[PDB]
Amino acid sequence: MAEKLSPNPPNLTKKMKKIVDAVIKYKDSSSGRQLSEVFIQLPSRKELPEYYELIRKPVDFKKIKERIRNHKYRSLNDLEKDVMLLCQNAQTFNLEGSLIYEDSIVLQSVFTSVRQKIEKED
């Protein structure tokens, strides 16, 4: 099947993984809820058919991680786009003010600050 992609510069792959790991690890300081936890693994098309009806380009953090390992992302812009899509998809499928919709909003901000921090190191 698929033809292997040229590996990214390793430093770029390490930056990608660092950023997504901080995002995934992030905790609401009050509840300790890992905001990411519901976004790790999207539910099956068999279990939640209506999801895949409204959301044409679904994405979870498992796929984002896969896409980093496979060098599908060629830049941090490419990674960011997919995390922002993850958050947009949440905001489309869930009603505003809901736990999942508002958590996705916070995760955008955590991505942005985490990215900045990591890029400011080099």
Author numbering: 1447 to 1568
Paper text:
Despite large sequence variations, all BRD modules share a conserved fold that comprises a left-handed bundle of four α helices (αZ, αA, αB, αC), linked by loop regions of variable length (ZA and BC loops), which line the Kac binding site and determine binding specificity. The four helices form a deep cavity that is extended by the two loop regions (ZA and BC loops), creating a largely hydrophobic Kac binding pocket.
BRDs are evolutionarily conserved and present in diverse nuclear proteins comprising HATs (GCN5, PCAF), ATP-dependent chromatin-remodeling complexes (BAZ1B), helicases (SMARCA), methyltransferases (MLL, ASH1L), transcriptional coactivators (TRIM/TIF1, TAFs) transcriptional mediators (TAF1), nuclear-scaffolding proteins (PB1), and the BET family (Muller et al., 2011). The most notable structural difference within the BRD core fold is a hairpin insertion located between helix αZ and the ZA loop that is present in all family VIII members. The proximity to the Kac binding site suggests that this insert may play a role in recruitment of acetylated binding partners. Helix αZ is flanked by a diverse sequence region and a β hairpin insert present in all family VIII BRDs.
